[PDB]
Amino acid sequence: MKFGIEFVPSDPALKIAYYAKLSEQQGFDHVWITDHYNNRDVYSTLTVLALNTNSIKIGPGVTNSYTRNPAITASSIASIAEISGGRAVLGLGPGDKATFDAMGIAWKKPLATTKEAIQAIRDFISGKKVSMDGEMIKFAGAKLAFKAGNIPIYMGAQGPKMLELAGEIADGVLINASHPKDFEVAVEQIKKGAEKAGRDPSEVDVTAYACFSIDKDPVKAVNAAKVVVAFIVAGSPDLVLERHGIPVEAKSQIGAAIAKGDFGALMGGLVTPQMIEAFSICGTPDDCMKRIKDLEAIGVTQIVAGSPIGPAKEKAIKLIGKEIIAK
Amino acid sequence: MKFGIEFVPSDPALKIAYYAKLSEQQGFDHVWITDHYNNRDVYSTLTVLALNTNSIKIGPGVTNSYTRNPAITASSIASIAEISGGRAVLGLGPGDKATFDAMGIAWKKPLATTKEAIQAIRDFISGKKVSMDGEMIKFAGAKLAFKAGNIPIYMGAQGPKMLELAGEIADGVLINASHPKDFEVAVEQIKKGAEKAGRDPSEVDVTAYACFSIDKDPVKAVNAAKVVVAFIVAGSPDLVLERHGIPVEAKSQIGAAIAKGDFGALMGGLVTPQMIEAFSICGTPDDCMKRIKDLEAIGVTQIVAGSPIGPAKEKAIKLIGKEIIAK
Amino acid sequence: MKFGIEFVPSDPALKIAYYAKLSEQQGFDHVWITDHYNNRDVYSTLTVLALNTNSIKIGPGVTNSYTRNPAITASSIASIAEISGGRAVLGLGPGDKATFDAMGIAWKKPLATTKEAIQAIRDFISGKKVSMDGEMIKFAGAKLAFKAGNIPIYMGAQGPKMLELAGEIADGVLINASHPKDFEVAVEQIKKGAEKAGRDPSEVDVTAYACFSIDKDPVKAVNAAKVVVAFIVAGSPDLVLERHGIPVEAKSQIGAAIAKGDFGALMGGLVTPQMIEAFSICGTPDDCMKRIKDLEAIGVTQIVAGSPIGPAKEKAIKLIGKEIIAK
Amino acid sequence: MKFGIEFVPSDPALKIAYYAKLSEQQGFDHVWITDHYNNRDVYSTLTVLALNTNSIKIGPGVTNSYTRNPAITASSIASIAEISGGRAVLGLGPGDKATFDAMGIAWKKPLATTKEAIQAIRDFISGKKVSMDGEMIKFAGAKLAFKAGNIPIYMGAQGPKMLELAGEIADGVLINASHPKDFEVAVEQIKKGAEKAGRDPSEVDVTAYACFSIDKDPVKAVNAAKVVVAFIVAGSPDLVLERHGIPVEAKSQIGAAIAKGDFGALMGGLVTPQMIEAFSICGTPDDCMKRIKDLEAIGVTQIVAGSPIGPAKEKAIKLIGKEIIAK
Ligand SMILES: C[C@H](OP(=O)(O)OC[C@@H](O)[C@@H](O)[C@@H](O)Cn1c2nc(=O)[nH]c(=O)c-2cc2ccc(O)cc21)C(=O)N[C@@H](CCC(=O)N[C@@H](CCC(=O)O)C(=O)O)C(=O)O
Ligand SMILES: C[C@H](OP(=O)(O)OC[C@@H](O)[C@@H](O)[C@@H](O)Cn1c2nc(=O)[nH]c(=O)c-2cc2ccc(O)cc21)C(=O)N[C@@H](CCC(=O)N[C@@H](CCC(=O)O)C(=O)O)C(=O)O
Ligand SMILES: C[C@H](OP(=O)(O)OC[C@@H](O)[C@@H](O)[C@@H](O)Cn1c2nc(=O)[nH]c(=O)c-2cc2ccc(O)cc21)C(=O)N[C@@H](CCC(=O)N[C@@H](CCC(=O)O)C(=O)O)C(=O)O
Numbered sequence A, B, C, D: 001m002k003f004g005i006e007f008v009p010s011d012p013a014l015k016i017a018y019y020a021k022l023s024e025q026q027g028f029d030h031v032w033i034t035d036h037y038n039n040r041d042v043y044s045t046l047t048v049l050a051l052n053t054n055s056i057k058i059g060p061g062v063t064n065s066y067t068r069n070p071a072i073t074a075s076s077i078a079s080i081a082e083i084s085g086g087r088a089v090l091g092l093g094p095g096d097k098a099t100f101d102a103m104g105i106a107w108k109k110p111l112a113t114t115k116e117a118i119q120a121i122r123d124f125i126s127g128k129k130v131s132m133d134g135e136m137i138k139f140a141g142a143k144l145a146f147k148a149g150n151i152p153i154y155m156g157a158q159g160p161k162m163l164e165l166a167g168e169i170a171d172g173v174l175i176n177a178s179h180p181k182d183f184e185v186a187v188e189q190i191k192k193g194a195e196k197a198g199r200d201p202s203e204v205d206v207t208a209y210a211c212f213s214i215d216k217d218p219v220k221a222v223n224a225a226k227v228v229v230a231f232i233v234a235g236s237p238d239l240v241l242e243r244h245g246i247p248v249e250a251k252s253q254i255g256a257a258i259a260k261g262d263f264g265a266l267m268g269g270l271v272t273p274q275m276i277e278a279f280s281i282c283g284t285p286d287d288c289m290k291r292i293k294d295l296e297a298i299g300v301t302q303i304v305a306g307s308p309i310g311p312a313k314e315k316a317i318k319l320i321g322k323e324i325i326a327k
């Protein structure tokens, strides 16, 4: 089992560099950095992380094909590959509608766009002169002027079609879920895509980009996760809420409280233990270990400790290293 | 007189950081970094520069509004402002047609786009929630989540209209020219724009983004600048070649030789001494000083030593520091 | 009033770099780093601080003349001056007997050694070829091979004689005290030394290297400072305890409790409010401001927030910046 | 065969960091940094190299037991081990008489001092509380307060006794020589020491710390080496000079010209081709490969490209990577 961790550039990069360094010392394999125009740049951030780490792999989790031309993304991830000595990996997703509305971006044909963008990027990184005339992406003789070395590409995917596409073209899949039921479905979609492309499905690093919260005190752990779990439930499609036996009505109820900023309600009972059990990996190290082994049995090969990671980051990272990674 | 220097990310960022540090030690005020998808990322590069410098101002010279959404540009330059302690400055231009053709980008309405992008960026950096519905740029409630501090914005401009627009909205103008005749025309355009906006024209940092080549041996200096002068002449609009008494036919002749890669012709006599005198600041420290003071008299407030800088960068940077900046 | 802050390399340098950066943003003038063989190297630590800061002054507080040959100290502080663009300042003291016993070092003639070491160091930094044949320090034609620029030298001093020597040769004095009574005596000593050397006593930056603990909640503040105050009282010479009306017997009682590790006694009443008032600057921002202005009236020109700084570092640094430095 | 490279801090650390990064990309295993009070600090330099590299091993080549108390050396190399993620290696030698004279340091019992210092350092790094009462080095309960991980220790040695001691206690030996004849003798000495200690002699990394100069043009190569070779000669014991048929007169001759600053002399005659063959590995890649394979057959396991490396460093580092390391 590979282990990764996620940091949001809502903190200065220098502070994140320390968490990433700590992760490297604790045995993590990957640190992933979110990309949203409203927080710090994903690349200046990756640059200070690369300078302050030595062996851990790093990369965006996930950037997209719309806020930056794919040639710029290729050049950027390659730059981080050079600075870090080949530890860069590219996480690309279609982007989320909310962020795009604010940016005045037309989310047009996510599927085709993403596939074309990844094809173009793989060719750039590969050193080829790129010429494309796709339904969304086009290049006429573009080419990088420095060498990239090898850069794995992971797709961010939730929907059945994106999952299938990931099995067809990605080296890994970052899935925003925490429960075995969700990965049971995801693994099948990835498998269909893998066969459709004729590649061995076990080639793809199926990873759980989970809401993670660990602590020796389980109630301290769940409390740190409630708000995040709330936002997850608020944005979960009916189909998913269904799968976990969670009243679809609870979504509106929670969306409401969030709209009103009534976090007192969220902590007060709105976030039920069922929501916590279905949308996060939390509790004591034992609780988290059990969930992790269930995911392993279903075919998950990398587990990423996503926000909040735990009540206090530094202590949680150490807990994970000592009580989990050291298996 | 302020002094700046330009570096192209066709060299690894670590090597550029040393040149930048040396420039800081030699008394330069600004280092500017070019932005082209085919070289290293302008931002990962600015990040390593920021970490290895302390007081010199830094920034892209120049990025654009098309290869990255303006919100991403705001976030990135603000990120560099945070890391460097407020030493970031933003250089924005409309971009060059050649690069955009390769990237499959429609250069649509450079003027309106650039104006709207700068208005949006100033608002982001300023901490406002941005809502726009311009003819090229739109945002719906977008807003940065961290504070930017103050970030001056410089426009890259060559054409009369861009120049006028810079006088109307920018804090400085990076003009790709080297001769007083060109700046005589540019200063008038900037002045028209400044009056059109009701601001004091002396607020804008009129800067000469020149082709610079300095050495104790003048012939070593001109030879280092010929190829660059060639590309400048090849892309100069008839109107400009005219102004310097350079046969407009020479442009085709040189464009030809460049197409065939016959640099032996370029060095052999195609680049005339007249072209060198009109499109570059080069020679010995005295020659360069004379030209610089001529530009100063015309109203130039910042001189940037652009490529090649000199036969060997390290020695040239020291020469400029010792024989020019120390006035 | 200048403001400084102290960090002990008992934390990794990367974590300290963030606190130092924060201090820079909060308006501090100096960050000082302690030097003891048992924690991280004072210089590798200053190196990562220099790379992650831009304007704040940095330096050891304080290193000494025994654990490293003075020529090495000269070279090291000059190396940090180069990397940081001239923000290095040298804090040198005679060293503490406890640390030296462990290192098997004979604390021989602190006074003469310190004076000779500082004379040699000033000459190295100044570019001179050094030749000395003092009663403790000797050099025969030694000389730095790179330029240092200017580096102020601060002496660490507690005793009347060291204080006098500081007034005679240092640019500043780091005094381990927090109460006006102690600085009343110190300022006289520094003045005697200043006159003995014929220099204007107001040239020296008289600074209070104080035990500092600030918080909106005063009791949270004093509790964070008790253990540190305990060790201060435990090591205070009878003369000093006397000056603050503190039973000299309390020193043994506290030393005992410390020996037995009975910190429950220290928190339980052993550390009296009188000890807290005489050996630390703590309480709410108002309490701290009052003490600071008392020190200012006595002639203190720099106040350093030494350990613990506050219940939690990050929050305390921000408190000091907002409720104190912004005067 | 392992490959290493040496840099002297007579250049700013930022510039060295690029050469080190390049070496990492070109396949070198080790970069070694010299330690002399007159150049930049060996540790601030190692700190910037560590931040700008990722996998290559780094360390002082070589520091000593006299200019810094061994506990400080332990703490410093441990600090670099932490920052670099365990890539630190310690090179310790007895120091050279010329540097010590200038520093006013009595070179007392190099052998016992070096052995005791290494024993103390291994114990510090190992986490032990150190107590020693040797004939040169003493400690009373000293102990590091942070964990070092593993740090190999290499000894710098030329003399037969130092070589024997290295075989007895070191993990590797950095020998200042370039010719098989010298390594034939050294390997025997190291073997005697290894048997005296009962360890397998093939445990020690016998390395040639050679004067190296490589270039497609053998003559520009040997000219780049003349100065370094001059200093190597003027410092060779007559036992050595005699070993290479070089007139023991040529040392006073060369030494004189050095004191005079007469480098024209060294370049135009005093440094003979006998001296170049005797004390350096230089010519074309083929010439260098032949010599390297000769050393390999004699038992050398690491070859370090020491100054000048080649006519121009950057090009030489690439030549070695391409035409030698890629074997
Ligand atoms: C587009 C969407 O795909 P999705 O996989 O559900 O996307 C939801 C989220 O994964 C997506 O918004 C992400 O980018 C969110 N996201 C982040 N997004 C960010 O922008 N930044 C982040 O840091 C972030 C982190 C992150 C980590 C992992 C992860 O999986 C997601 C993350 C969708 O609904 N797809 C459906 C429908 C497909 C469909 O038909 N879409 C197009 C296809 C058009 C064509 O085929 O050309 C259509 O309508 O025509 C499907 O996959 O079946
Ligand atoms: C668009 C063009 O502008 P220009 O200023 O002449 O363009 C030349 C360059 O400044 C521009 O191509 C640059 O971005 C090139 N450039 C680089 N370009 C890059 O992309 N990146 C770099 O790193 C680079 C370095 C550089 C440094 C400084 C600098 O001055 C320019 C640099 C132009 O022709 N403008 C005309 C007319 C423009 C016009 O009329 N507007 C639109 C109408 C828009 C509307 O109203 O709807 C039209 O032409 O259709 C004018 O200035 O009057
Ligand atoms: C030497 C000593 O000076 P002192 O000022 O009392 O020393 C106390 C401390 O300053 C000394 O232990 C420090 O180095 C502690 N110290 C640190 N020391 C460290 O080793 N590391 C640190 O990072 C640290 C932090 C610190 C910060 C500020 C500061 O004020 C000093 C700091 C002393 O006792 N001096 C007396 C007596 C001097 C005297 O005449 N006796 C000696 C003088 C030598 C001679 O005769 O020439 C002799 O005769 O034996 C006096 O000043 O009156």
Ligand SMILES: C[C@H](OP(=O)(O)OC[C@@H](O)[C@@H](O)[C@@H](O)Cn1c2nc(=O)[nH]c(=O)c-2cc2ccc(O)cc21)C(=O)N[C@@H](CCC(=O)N[C@@H](CCC(=O)O)C(=O)O)C(=O)O
Binding pocket: D033, D034, D035, D036, D061, D062, D063, D064, D093, D094, D095, D096, D097, D099, D108, D109, D110, D111, D112, D113, D155, D156, D157, D158, D159, D160, D161, D162, D163, D174, D175, D176, D209
């Ligand atoms: C002391 C001397 O040792 P040596 O090994 O010949 O020393 C020559 C060099 O290795 C030594 O001066 C180095 O520190 C030089 N040196 C550097 N030294 C530096 O100071 N800085 C550097 O960065 C540097 C570069 C370098 C890299 C590799 C390398 O091998 C050496 C380097 C010597 O005389 N050794 C004799 C024995 C001497 C002896 O026995 N005398 C004493 C021994 C102590 C005792 O009695 O126990 C005596 O018996 O009294 C021997 O090896 O047989």
Ligand SMILES: [Cl-]
Binding pocket: B050, B051, B052, B053, B054, C050, C051, C052, C053, C054
């Ligand atoms: Cl910096």
Ligand SMILES: [Cl-]
Binding pocket: A050, A051, A052, A053, A054, D050, D051, D052, D053, D054
């Ligand atoms: Cl690194």
